[PDB]
Amino acid sequence: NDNVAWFKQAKYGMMIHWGLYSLLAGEYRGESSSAYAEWIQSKFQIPNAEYGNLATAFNPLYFDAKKIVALAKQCGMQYLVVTTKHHDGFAMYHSKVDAYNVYDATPFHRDIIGELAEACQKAGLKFGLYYSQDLDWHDPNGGGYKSNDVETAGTTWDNSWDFPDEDQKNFDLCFDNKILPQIKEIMSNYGDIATAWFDVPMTLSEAQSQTIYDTVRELQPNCLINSRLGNGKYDFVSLGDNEIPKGFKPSPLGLYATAGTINDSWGFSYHDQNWKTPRTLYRYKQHLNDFGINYLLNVGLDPLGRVPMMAEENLLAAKALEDEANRL
Amino acid sequence: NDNVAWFKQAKYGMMIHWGLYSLLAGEYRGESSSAYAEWIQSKFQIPNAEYGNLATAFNPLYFDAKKIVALAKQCGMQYLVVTTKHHDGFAMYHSKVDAYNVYDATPFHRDIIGELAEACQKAGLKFGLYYSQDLDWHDPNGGGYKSNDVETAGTTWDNSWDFPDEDQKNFDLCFDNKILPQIKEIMSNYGDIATAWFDVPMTLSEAQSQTIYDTVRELQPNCLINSRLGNGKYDFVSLGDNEIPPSPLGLYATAGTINDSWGFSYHDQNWKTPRTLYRYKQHLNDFGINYLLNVGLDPLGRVPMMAEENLLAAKALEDEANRL
Amino acid sequence: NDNVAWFKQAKYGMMIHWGLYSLLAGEYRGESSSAYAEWIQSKFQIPNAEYGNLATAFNPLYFDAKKIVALAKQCGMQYLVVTTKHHDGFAMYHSKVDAYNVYDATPFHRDIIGELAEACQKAGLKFGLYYSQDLDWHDPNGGGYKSNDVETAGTTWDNSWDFPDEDQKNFDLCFDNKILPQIKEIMSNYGDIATAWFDVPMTLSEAQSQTIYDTVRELQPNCLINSRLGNGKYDFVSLGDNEIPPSPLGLYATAGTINDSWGFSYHDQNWKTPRTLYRYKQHLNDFGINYLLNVGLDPLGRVPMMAEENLLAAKALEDEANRL
Amino acid sequence: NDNVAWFKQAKYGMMIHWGLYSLLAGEYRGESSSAYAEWIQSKFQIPNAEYGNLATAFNPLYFDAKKIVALAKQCGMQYLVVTTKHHDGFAMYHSKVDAYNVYDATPFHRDIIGELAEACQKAGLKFGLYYSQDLDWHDPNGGGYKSNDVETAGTTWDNSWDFPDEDQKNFDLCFDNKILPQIKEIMSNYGDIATAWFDVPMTLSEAQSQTIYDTVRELQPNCLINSRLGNGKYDFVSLGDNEIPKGFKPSPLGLYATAGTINDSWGFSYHDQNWKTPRTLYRYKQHLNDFGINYLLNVGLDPLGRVPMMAEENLLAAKALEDEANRL
C-alpha cells in the first residue's frame, strides 16, 4: 500500500455535496435554512413524502463530471471525494437495495457517483467516497434517536416527525437492511476507492463499526479510512477546524486531513454569498499543508449540477496566488 | 369604463417575471449575466436548441398562484401583471399557435397564466398581461434585426446567432404567424384583462401597431393599454425611472424591481431595503403614478425569501406611517 | 427595590460597544479582524504605544446621546447599557485614576458615559454599565495571563506582547491600582445605575469578586448585578445564546448583536433581518428573558445606517403583530 | 516629449479619491449617499459650515504614500493620479490661495499631494493630478449654476443651498480668484506632472478653457492633458465606459485612457461592498490594453487613509491571474 505515501503528498482535494437539499437551496416556505443547507429536511422537519418528491424536479441539465474534475485538476487537487448518501437517506448512485436514489427516482436517470468515478480515472485523479452510516431520515429506524440530548444544524438528529416512536425504534433493523448493504454496493462498483469518509457514530454498536471497517478492507484493501468511523478502525485522522495547530486520536501512518467549504454551507444555498476570498483559501491550504494536513475543499453543486460561479472564480484565483508565490 | 377610475386609485401592483431564463439564474458556463438575468439568452447567444431544452428541467414543484396573490393582497397591491411571453419567445400559457410553451414543452404541463388569472379573480385582484410583440429570439424572423445600431442588456436585439441573415429577414412573417395570433389567444382566454403592457416597437409597422390596439379593443374593451405600444394607441403612459418627478385620461404607472434584475438571479442579492420600497411607492403615489413592483420567481416557482420579507416589511412601515 | 419588578417587565434594552477599536473597524494592515472587531488589539497584538495613539484620531463629530436614546425609546427599549471600559483598558468616561480615557487622551475631550447617563435620565430610560474587571491589555499586570490554555477571539486573553513575563505577573497590582478604584468612579458618578454587567472572572480571587459586589451594593443599592461576576454575587443571570430554551429573583437577560460583531466593522454587513430581530425578541420575552440588542457606534459616533433601519423595521413588525 | 511614447506602453495606473467626503463614507443622518459617495455634500445639500467642520476630524493615522505606491508598483501600475481638489472645493495640498485645505484646516497638518508625488518619484512611478476646474461647492460663485437642466449624482451641480442666487452668480469671480491660481500652485510645485485630468466644462468660457491649457503648457510642458478640458486643448482622450470598443473626438497622438473603480463608488463608502472580482479587473484591463486604452483603476482611501482591505486583495489577485496568464 503506497496509497499511504501518495496521501502524504496529495495536499489538496475537491469535496462534492449534492442531493435533493440542493434544489431547495437553503430556502423553505419563505424562511432560511441553518448555516448548513444540506440539513434543511431536519431544520423544517419536511415529511419524506414532500422532501422525496424533490426527486421529480432533479434534472441537472448542465452536470458534467469531465469539467468538474478538469477544474479540480487545474487547481492542483489530486483526489475528489463525493457524497454517495447524506443524512437525507437519498443515494446519488444506482442502489439495488433502495429505489430512493438519483437513477430510479429522478427524470435525470443517471448514476452521478459513476460518471465522477470514471471522469477521475480518465483525468488521473484518485476517487474518494462519503456515506452517512448512522443518520438516515428516510429510514423508519434512522440513527440518532438515542442522542438528541444535544442541539444540531436542524432539529433532532433522527427523523422524529415521520417516525415519532423513539421508545419503539431499533437501528439494527436499519443497519442490516440498508447501511451495510449500501456500503458494499459503493465499495464493490465504481472502480478503485482511494479514500472513505464516515460520520462520528452516535447510535452505532462497536460490532457495526468493526463490520463496516472489515467490509471496506475486504472490498477496497488500498482504501484509506477516516478516523470518525472507529477508534481502532482507521488509517488517517480527520481534524475538525478546532483541532488545527497554531482527545487527539493517534495517527499511526502520520496521515491528517481537514474538510472545509468556500462559503459557510456544504450543500448549495442562494442566500449564502459569503465566499472565502482567494487569499483566505490559499493561506489556509498553505497553513494545513505546512502542518502535514490535507485540505479537502468542498464545492456544493446547484440545482442544474453546476459549480457556483464564485466557487470556481475563487478556486482558480487561489491557485494563481499559490503559483505566483511558489515562483516568488 | 370605470376601470379608468379604479386605475387612478390602484397605486400598488405586483409584476411577475418567469420563464426558462429563471432556471439559469443569471449564470451561464461559469460567467455572470448582465444586470438583466432574463436577457441571458441574448447575452451569451445561447442556441434555441440548447436554451429551449431548459423546458425539460422546468418542474416548479412549489409554484402556488393562490399564495403569490395572497402575498400581493396582504402588501395592498390591487392588480397583478405577468409575462405571457418575454423576448426568449417561450409562452408561459397553453398557446395553440406555438408548442414552444410551458404546457406542451415542460414536465410541469400546466398553464401558469391560467392559474394566476383564476387566483386573482377568486382573491378579488385585477389581472394584467405583458407580451413582447417585437422581439422573439425563438422566431427565425424575430424583431430587432434592423435596430442593432444601439447596445442592449445582451448582444443584439434579435437572434443574430441562430439566424445570421439580417439582409434576408422579414418580420411580417413573424407577426402574421405568431405575434397577432398569440396576442388574440391571451386576450381571448384568461377572463377579464384589466391592463396590457407592451415593449417599445423597433421593427414594427404603424399598421402592425394599430392592428394590436384594435385586436385588444375588440377582445378586451375595458383593458387599459400601455403607451409603449403606439403614440395614438394607449390609455395610460409608462414612465421609465428617468421620467419621474400626453396622458388624456391622466393615468401613469412605473415598473420597478426589488433587486437590480427582473428575471431571478442567484448572485443578485442587492434587495432594496423595506424603507426604500415604501419611500419610492410613497413618492410615485404622491405624484399620481402607480408603482408596479416586480417579483422574479425562482426555478421552483417560489417568491425569493428576501423579496417576500422586504415586501411585507415595506407594508408594515407604510401602515405604521398611515396611523402616525 | 421595585427595580427588580421593572426588570421583569423591561423586555428590551440597547447595548453600546464603543472605543478605540471602533476607529480601526475590523481592519488592520490590509488584514481582517475576527468575528469580534473589539478584540482587534489582541488579534494582531497591537502595541499599547500604537493602539493608544488611536485616541489622537478619536473626534466623533456626529455623536449625539439624545438621538441614540431617542432611537432606543422609539424601538420600545426601556434601558441602555454602555461599555465604560472594554478589554483594551481604555475608559470612555473621565477617570481620575487613569488618564488612558476619552476625556483626557482624545481631541473630543468629552465624557460619553456622562452624556448617555444624562440623555437616558431626561428621556426616562434606566442606565446600565459594563466594565472588564479581569482583562486589561493597557495594564502591565492585566488579567488572563494564567488562563491561556483555551483559544480566544484574538490571540492571548492578556497583553502577552507588551508584557511577556507571565512568570513575574501579579493581578493584585492591577486590581488595587485600577480595577476597584475605576468601578467606584463609574458607580459613584453618572446618577442612578439600574444594571451592572461584568465578564466571567478567569484571573480574579473570590475576595476580589466579593469586593466588587460589596462596592456596587454600598454605592448603587438598587443596581441589579449580572451572574458572570460571582456564584453568590448577583441578582439576574446572563444566558449566552447556547443557554436559551439558579436565579432567586427569577430574572434573566441575553445580550445579542444586529450583525456578527459587537464593536463596529466595515466588512461586517451581515445585519440580522427586521423579521429575525423581532422573532428573537419575541422568543426571549415569551421565555421571560430580557433582550439586550447591541449597537456598535462607528468612528464618527453614529448608529450604522442598516442598524437603525432594521431596529425601526423590527419595531414596526412587532407593533403590526400586536394589533393583528 | 517621449512622455507620449511612455503613455502608449503605460497600460495600468492607480487613481486616488480622498477628501472630507471619505469621513462620512456614503452615510449621512441615517440615510445612504448615491452610487457616488464623494458627491455626498450635493446629495444632502450639507452646509459648507457643517461639511467643512469634517476637516477637524481628518487625522488619518495610517496614511502612508510609500505603501500606496508600493502596492501600485507590485500590481504593475506605471503611474498614480490623485485628487488635488474635488467638487467639494477642499484642496488635499498646501494651497497659498485658499486655507480650505488638508494642511491648514486639519489636525493632520500634512500635504498629501506632496508625500504621494515624492513617494512616486522615489519608487520610479510617474505622477498625475486631477482638479475640478468647473464645480466648487465651497465657492460662492461655484460652477454649474447655469447647467441644472439635467440630473446629477447629488442634487444641483452648484452649491444651490448656501448660495441660492443663480440670477446674481458670476463664475468669472471664482475662476480668477481660486481656479486659475490653484491650478498654477499644483502645476508649479510637486515636481514633474506626467498627466492632468480635468472635468467636462459646463460653466466655463472658451477663454478660461484655453487659459488652463496654456497655464499647464507653460508650467508642465511634458504633461499630457485630458480631452475633457477642451476640443483643441488635449493630448490623450478619456473614454467613459459607453465609449469602449466591442462624437468620437480625434486623438492625434493616438493616446486613450479609461478611469474605473473596484466597487461602484469613487470616494470611500461603508455600505458599498460590491468589489469587482479579481477575474473582472484582469479581464477589463486585458480588453482595454488590447484596444490601446490605458486602464486607470481607482482606490477610494478610508478615514484612516488606508487602502480598503478588499480593494488591495482584488488588485493583487488580479495581478496574479494576469501573471499566470502571461506565462500560460
PDB file of C-alpha atoms in Angstrom, chain D residues 29 55 122 173 210 290 305:
ATOM      1  CA  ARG D  29     -28.054  61.186   9.204  1.00  0.00           C
ATOM      2  CA  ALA D  55     -11.657  68.871   8.468  1.00  0.00           C
ATOM      3  CA  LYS D 122      11.453  57.575  -5.234  1.00  0.00           C
ATOM      4  CA  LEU D 173     -15.159  85.775  -9.858  1.00  0.00           C
ATOM      5  CA  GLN D 210      -7.606  77.894 -23.319  1.00  0.00           C
ATOM      6  CA  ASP D 290      -5.730  45.135 -26.300  1.00  0.00           C
ATOM      7  CA  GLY D 305      -6.076  56.881   4.875  1.00  0.00           C
TER       8      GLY D 305
END
